[PDB]
Design a protein around this ligand. Structure first.
Ligand code: CDL
Ligand code: CDL
Ligand code: PLX
Lengths: 121, 87
């Protein structure tokens, strides 16, 4: 386990207060659209299993499927973006704190670099 | 037409010997050349004249794209993707 045990981690918290400094996902996000598509597919499968007209029966429950999937997907995307931002922040902090472990290397141009040539014949 | 550079595409001067017949018989090649000029060359020349007159009514130009010089892979640093792409 990598992230668990991080200092300042409040248990059983889906979104801490520091996650509110990040841009919230746009409502037109392709991931949100895919979540809504999954909800619509679940509604169609529900109609098919229960032996109802697939594309015309249960419009209210299909709408509820889509809405629930979009809601949960939005919150899941917020948490995912927060976790990735936290990972990048920790990585950059450690790189700053350990310059001898992450040193800069000399940049030699290809004119100076010697590389072997392997003919194709 | 000669819309090309003679220096880039060299061609030695053309030496055509003059016709010096030694017989009284007529020349079928010459007669057929006259017939060909009367029947083919003149009509195609007239058609080309009409077409080129129509082309000169609206004359527009196109250009040869010039590409700037950029630093090459010798000057590019290692793992420098933009300079490597340009080179
Ligand atoms: C009645 C309908 C009412 C609702 C109508 C729509 C309302 C919203 C309209 C709108 O404007 O939305 C904005 C939004 C675009 O806004 P944007 O910010 O400008 O996005 C532009 C770029 O896409 C922005 O690109 P990006 O750099 O931000 O990243 C794009 C992409 C980067 O990632 C990728 O490109 C990878 C995508 C494939 C990943 C998985 C591949 C392997 C599995 C494939 C099969 C999976 C099972 C099915 O990542 C994603 O999109 C993540 C979610 C991917 C879900 C869709 C693709 C997977 C399913 C493909 C099925 C075929 O519109 C959409 O996303 C609509 C897409 C669907 C249109 C309908 C027709 C189907 C097209 C299928 C294409 C499949 C490829
Ligand atoms: C935007 C594009 C999105 C594309 C999405 C593609 C993926 C969709 C996944 C989810 C699909 C859910 C389907 C539920 C079951 C439906 C079954 C059925 O009867 O359907 C007929 C049904 C109407 O007929 P019905 O009289 O009510 O039903 C007759 C009974 O079923 C009585 O008929 P029966 O019982 O006599 O039928 C016998 C049949 C009964 O068996 C079936 O019908 C089963 C078919 C498969 C269902 C389970 C699929 C699970 C997910 C597989 C994912 C694979 C990868 C997909 C990658 C997709 C990438 C895009 O069994 C057999 O024939 C036995 C042999 C089976 C061979 C293997 C079949 C399975 C292949 C597996 C892959 C299939 C993928 C495509 C499935 C498409 C289904 C519509 O029509 C539809 O369901 C049409 C749905 C699509 C159009 C909806 C209207 C849209 C209008 C606005 C368009 C706007 C466009 C832009 C905005 C878009 C916003 C979203
Ligand atoms: C298809 C398979 C995925 C199924 C998805 C549904 C599974 C159940 C989801 C239930 C979500 C409940 C969320 C309500 C708040 C719960 C808060 C708490 O319980 O969990 C928080 C968030 O933790 C949850 O586990 C995250 C929920 C993520 C739910 C979706 C997972 C998707 C996985 C990727 C599948 C692909 C996506 C498919 C679309 C969903 C904080 O956890 P924390 O105490 O602080 O961390 C230590 C605990 N450890 C040890 C387990 C790590």
């Amino acid at each position: 386990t990598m992230m668990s045990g991080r200092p300042g981690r409040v248990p059983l918290q889906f979104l801490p207060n520091e996650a509110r400094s990040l841009p919230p996902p746009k409502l037109t996000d392709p991931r949100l659209v895919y979540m809504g598509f999954l909800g619509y597919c679940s509604g169609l499968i529900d109609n098919a299993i229960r032996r109802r007209p697939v594309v015309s029966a249960g419009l209210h429950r299909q709408l509820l499927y889509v809405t629930s999937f979009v809601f949960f997907g939005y919150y899941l995307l917020k948490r995912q973006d927060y976790m990735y931002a936290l990972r990048d922040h920790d990585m950059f902090a450690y790189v700053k704190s350990h310059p001898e472990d992450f040193p800069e290397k000399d940049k030699k141009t290809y004119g100076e670099i010697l590389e072997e040539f392997h003919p194709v014949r | 037409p000669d819309s090309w550079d003679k220096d880039v595409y060299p061609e030695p001067p053309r030496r055509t010997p003059a016709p010096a017949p030694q017989t009284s018989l007529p020349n079928p090649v010459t007669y057929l050349t006259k017939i060909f000029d009367l029947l083919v060359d003149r009509p195609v020349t007239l058609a080309r004249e009409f077409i080129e007159q129509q082309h000169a009514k609206n004359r527009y130009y196109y250009y040869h794209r010039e590409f700037r010089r950029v630093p090459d892979i010798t000057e590019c640093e290692e793992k420098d993707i933009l300079c490597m792409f340009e080179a």
